Nucleic acid binder design. Structure first.
Ligand SMILES: [Mg+2]
Length: 155
RNA sequence: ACAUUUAACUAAAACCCCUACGCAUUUAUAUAGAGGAGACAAGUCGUAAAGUGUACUGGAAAGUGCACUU
């Protein structure tokens, strides 16, 4: 598929890279993604002001996180909402305010994750650990998975 | 570590120590694998309000947010 150059780099970004974001983890824990080459904007007949990147996806035999897609999407989006802050500041929004501090601590403890890691520094295996612990919590709290902190901020 | 013997009616003889250097140290070569630069590719190729920086971007051919310039 052809994407915009920035989107192609983000889909094909490594850990720590300036383009590491939600798309990187989401595409890379399910597919082997390679950004093959970029086409400049002058090569398109109505010339855009952007470049274009061509990216190849191959589904992985063994996905790097064996969890439901929507659970992984929630975990990744909450991790990457504050991309330049410590990871725990993003994870704490997954839980209600009342249990925010305690549950985040339980999560990081059971996941063996350093709280000081920035989102751009988290590998797919860290996300695997966090997602497995989060699914266990959601099994042990049926109303957790449907929590949206913005709605509880509306009230 | 190691030690002054003989000899001396002219004067001479004798002399000989034991201890490594290595999975240490310096540089270089060969090898798996990965990554860059060069030739604007030449054509019997095709055709006729704006700007700058920075931050996020998962409905990104660019957008929005902040600050600036004419
Ligand atoms: Mg947008």
């Amino acid at each position: 598929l052809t994407f915009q150059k920035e989107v192609a780099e983000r889909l094909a970004a490594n850990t720590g890279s300036k383009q590491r974001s939600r798309l990187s983890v989401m595409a890379q824990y399910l597919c082997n993604v390679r950004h093959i080459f970029t086409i400049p904007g002058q090569a398109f007949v109505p010339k855009p002001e952007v470049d274009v990147g061509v990216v190849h996806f191959t589904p992985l035999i063994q996905p790097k996180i064996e969890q439901p897609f929507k659970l992984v999407e929630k975990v990744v989006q909450n991790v990457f909402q504050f991309r330049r802050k410590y990871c725990h500041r993003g994870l704490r929004m997954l839980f209600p305010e009342a249990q925010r501090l305690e549950s985040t601590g339980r999560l990081l403890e059971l996941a063996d994750i350093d709280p000081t890691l920035r989102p751009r520094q988290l590998s797919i295996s860290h996300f695997k650990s966090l997602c497995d612990v989060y699914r266990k919590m959601c099994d042990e709290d049926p109303q957790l998975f449907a929590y949206n902190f913005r709605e509880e901020l509306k009230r």
